[PDB]
Amino acid sequence: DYEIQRERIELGRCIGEGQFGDVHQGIYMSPENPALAVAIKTCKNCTSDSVREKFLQEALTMRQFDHPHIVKLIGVITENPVWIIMELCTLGELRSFLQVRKYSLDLASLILYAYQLSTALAYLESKRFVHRDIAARNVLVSSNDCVKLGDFGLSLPIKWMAPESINFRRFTSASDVWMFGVCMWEILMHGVKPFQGVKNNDVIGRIENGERLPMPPNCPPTLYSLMTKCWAYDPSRRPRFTELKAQLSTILEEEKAQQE
Ligand SMILES: Nc1ncnc2c1ncn2[C@@H]1O[C@H](COP(=O)(O)OP(=O)(O)OP(=O)(O)O)[C@@H](O)[C@H]1O
Known part of the structure; x- marks a missing residue:
């Protein structure tokens, strides 16, 4: 077929x-x-x-x-x-697309990309499918208003991974949320990599000390708080994609009204 x-x-x-x-x-x-x-x-x-x-x-x-x-x-x-x-997806890897259009892409579009990926991931969550590598590098761009998850068949990505994934090799719905948090951060950082210039082993120890990726310039505080929830050390404290989707929808509408 x-x-x-x-x-x-x-x-x-x-x-x-x-x-x-x-x-x-x-x-x-x-x-x-x-x-x-x-x-x-x-x-x-x-x-x-x-x-x-x-x-x-x-x-x-x-x-x-x-x-x-x-x-x-x-x-x-x-x-x-x-x-x-x-x-x-004619426009290619999300990361590059974000780096190139650093000063031509509105915040509304960034959150829309976050939102669109939360819909894909809610859907995968609904099928009990655990992705394992949610990262801007794994997102493709269809149009300036359409982003698509692309990475199956996989792989080390320590700086994107949930503690339990690095440590115990545990990959779950909750670990996908952790990574989606990092992907959101990447999008808001215009395709900049997390913990760049830090050794993988130093990231591990920082995370365990309560330390997190900083709020991106021009990131809404509501959106950074959402990222912060994705990065609960305890996987059970992490939101699910139904909630992330609903909250991103709401963050998106308010950014659209923030310039009208
Ligand atoms: N469906 C597609 N549409 C447009 N460009 C694509 C598509 N698939 C891949 N590319 C381009 O080719 C590159 C290689 O993508 P690919 O998915 O093979 O990465 P990979 O790490 O080898 O595989 P995976 O992401 O499945 O682990 C991408 O970064 C992107 O630039």
């Missing part, structure tokens, strides 16, 4: 480098309809079945999900060169 014939795909520009291979933009075309822009994840060592299985695992996972703010799987070509065909 998801297998694609590769003569229906034409590779275009290399739009990024992935863990397994280059990612290319391109087009999927079937006789009647668009003109579907697509991303094509390639896998250079795919002939090794060990890497192929780990490569296609992303597509298998993405397949379970159907949400406006989660990257859609379009198909796979499972003959090597093994390719994963997915929805093209």
Whole structure:
């Protein structure tokens, strides 16, 4: 149902480098309809079945999900060169998009990106799916008003991880919230990395002493308080995505009214 014939795909520009291979933009075309822009994840060592299985695992996972703010799987070509065909988010990785548009993107748009990701994550939470790596690097940009979660198949990211994940390797719905807190901070920091210039081991000890990422310049205090809740040391004290979504919706409306 998801297998694609590769003569229906034409590779275009290399739009990024992935863990397994280059990612290319391109087009999927079937006789009647668009003109579907697509991303094509390639896998250079795919002939090794060990890497192929780990490569296609992303597509298998993405397949379970159907949400406006989660990257859609379009198909796979499972003959090597093994390719994963997915929805093209033309504007690319969120981080870079934020760094480049540092002084052209309103606060309203930043919170909207936070909000849109809280809807994707509420949805994943509803399916009891634990993502494990919520980070700006894992968000793709569809339009200036649309952001999408993209990272399945995964990986060390100590500065994004909940204490219990670093320490005990425990990955839960509550740890995803911790990471979403950090992702929100990254967005408000215009794609700046957390704890930059601090050793991973120093972050660990700081966190345990009550220390947290500072309030971003121009961050609403209401939004920083929300981030602070995501970073409760005790995972059980962390909010869930239903509450984060509702509160981001409310923070968003008030920023829109803050200039009218
Ligand atoms: N669906 C897409 N639309 C647009 N650009 C993409 C898409 N997927 C990947 N890219 C680009 O290619 C780069 C590699 O993305 P990729 O998801 O392979 O990162 P990875 O760490 O290798 O994999 P994962 O995020 O699944 O762990 C991204 O940073 C982005 O620049």
